[PDB]
Amino acid sequence: MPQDIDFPAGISPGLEATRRHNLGWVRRLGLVGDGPSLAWYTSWDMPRLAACGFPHARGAALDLCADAMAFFFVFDDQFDGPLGRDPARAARVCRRLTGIVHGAGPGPGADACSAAFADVWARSTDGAHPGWVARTAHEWEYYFAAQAHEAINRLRGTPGDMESYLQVRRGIAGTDLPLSLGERAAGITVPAAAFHSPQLRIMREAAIDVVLMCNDVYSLEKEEARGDMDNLVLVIEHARRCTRDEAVTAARGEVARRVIRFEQLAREVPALCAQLGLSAVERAHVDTYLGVMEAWMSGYHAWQTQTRRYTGAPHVLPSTGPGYFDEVLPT
Ligand SMILES: CC[N+](CC)(CC)Cc1ccccc1
Ligand SMILES: [Mg+2]
Ligand SMILES: [Mg+2]
Ligand SMILES: [Mg+2]
């Protein structure tokens, strides 16, 4: 049981203000309607996810974090239905979103997902360093393009091997986008010389893996009944021919060894900055980047233990029907 499994240095003070902003935003954009969908959305507590996962974000930066999360979660659930069993259709819908990434704004009257994404993306890139924009644009492309491969795997009905699981799951989980968002919301720019160090590249990959694997464990109940295949627990069980409990234990171990690797490498970061001759301001941005990665790991988990999304989904949206009350994504 998820309540019996365990794997924040702060919480953003803007939580309550962002709750108010984000409630108006999802309704204004058409991303969340009224009634069941609104109560269900509210029960996820996207503001607390933003405030725990991005504690460096203040003011309008935290608003952006919560709106981005709102997009991720609402868009994600649109595939818990016929769309997630139709890879060609999923690929076409996600090509629409990808065009927004690379410059083709959707125009007035676009669907709610396209309009919400375009707003998040415009706010994200406004004033951002061009190196951040290029990298994050490609991160978005991977996220959108990976959804159809999850659908392919659902039709296959067997989990992939570990390598193929990671390739699909890292994409559909949002790849490095949460860390790009946290960097942007903290107002920092990681110097490229530090960003591409072996230590920080390994740490970034480890942090993203830790969070998606923690999600795999806690979201297994709602996913397994829908025929989802890109979940670490299912992958381990299938590869090892072990019991469910043995697979959960192994999944905890995949998380733990990555946290250990991350923390071992984090100890080298001061020396790395000195070897590169980074300025004091550059070193301060690297230090904040370390905190951003640390807070995504600890803050995501703090959120998922109190949200109603995972305990509630099997009861309010059973696997015998779609995983949404309203269609907001035209296919
Ligand atoms: C990033 C938000 N996400 C994935 C797109 C929305 C469903 C859930 C998630 C959070 C953290 C790790 C993995 C997945
Ligand atoms: Mg998903
Ligand atoms: Mg999902
Ligand atoms: Mg999940």
In a domain, 217, yes or no: yes
Give backbone dihedrals phi and psi of 30, rounded to 5 degrees, phi first: 80, 10
Q: For every residue of 53-65, which 3-state class applies, written as one string?
A: HCCCCCCHHHHHH
Q: Which of 127, 122, 149, 152 is nearest to 137 (CA)?
A: 122
Q: Which two tokens stand for residue 27?
A: 């309704």
In a domain, 7, yes or no: no
* 326, 39 contact by CB (below 8 A): no
Site to substitute for ligand 1 among 204, 215, 226, 303, most atoms within 8 A of C-beta: 215
Residue 153 Cα to ligand 4 midpoint, Å, equals 15
Atom of ligand 1 nearest to the CA of 69: 2
* 137, 102 contact by CB (below 8 A): yes
Exposure string over 225-234, b if 16+ CB within 10 A, otherwise e: ebebbbbbbb
> Which method resolved this structure?
X-ray
Exposure string over 143-174, b if 16+ CB within 10 A, otherwise e: bbbbbbbbbbbbeeeebbeeeebbebbbbbbb
Q: For every residue of 254-282, which 3-state class applies, written as one string?
A: HHHHHHHHHHHHHCCHHHHHHHCCCCHHH
d(CA 154, CA 319): 14
Length of the chain: 331
Question: If you ran DSSP here, which 8-state letter would residue 168 be given?
Answer: H
78 exposed, middle or buried (CB, 10 Å; 0-12, 13-18, 19+)? buried
3 state SS of 88: helix
d(CA 19, CA 48): 8
Q: Which of 251, 257, 223, 221 is nearest to 237 (CA)?
A: 251
In a domain, 323, yes or no: no
d(CA 288, CA 31): 32
d(CA 50, CA 8): 12
**Which residues, at least 6 apart from 42, have a Cβ–Cβ distance to it below 8 Å?**
23
d(CA 321, CA 206): 35
* 324, 317 contact by CB (below 8 A): yes
Q: What is the dihedral of CA 254, 260, 264, 266, to 10 degrees?
A: 90
CATH number assigned to the domain comprising residue 112: 1.10.600.10
Q: What is the dihedral of CA 140, 146, 148, 150, to 10 degrees?
A: -140
Residue 107 Cα to ligand 4 midpoint, Å, equals 32
- Residues with C-beta less than 6 Å from any ligand 1 atom: 72-73, 76, 173-174, 178, 211-212, 215, 300
* 80, 88 contact by CB (below 8 A): no
* 44, 309 contact by CB (below 8 A): yes
In a domain, 328, yes or no: no
In a domain, 8, yes or no: no
Q: Which two tokens stand for residue 108?
A: 């007035």
CA gyration radius for the chain?
A: 19
d(CA 329, CA 327): 6
d(CA 202, CA 206): 6
Number of domains in the chain: 1
For the chain, give the longest Cα–Cα distance: 59
Report the sign of the C-alpha dihedral through residues 103, 30, 65, 174, in that order. negative
* 185, 65 contact by CB (below 8 A): yes
Exposure string over 1-32, b if 16+ CB within 10 A, otherwise e: ebeeeebbeebbebbebbbebbbebbeebebb
Question: If you ran DSSP here, which 8-state letter would residue 317 be given?
Answer: S
* Segments forming the whole domain that contains residue 237: 14-316
In a domain, 4, yes or no: no
In a domain, 203, yes or no: yes
Which residue is associated with the tokens 């405030």?
A: 51
Nearest ligand, measured from the Cα of 317 = 3
- For residue 122, the one-letter residue type is A
In a domain, 179, yes or no: yes
**Which residues, at least 6 apart from 241, have a Cβ–Cβ distance to it below 8 Å?**
none
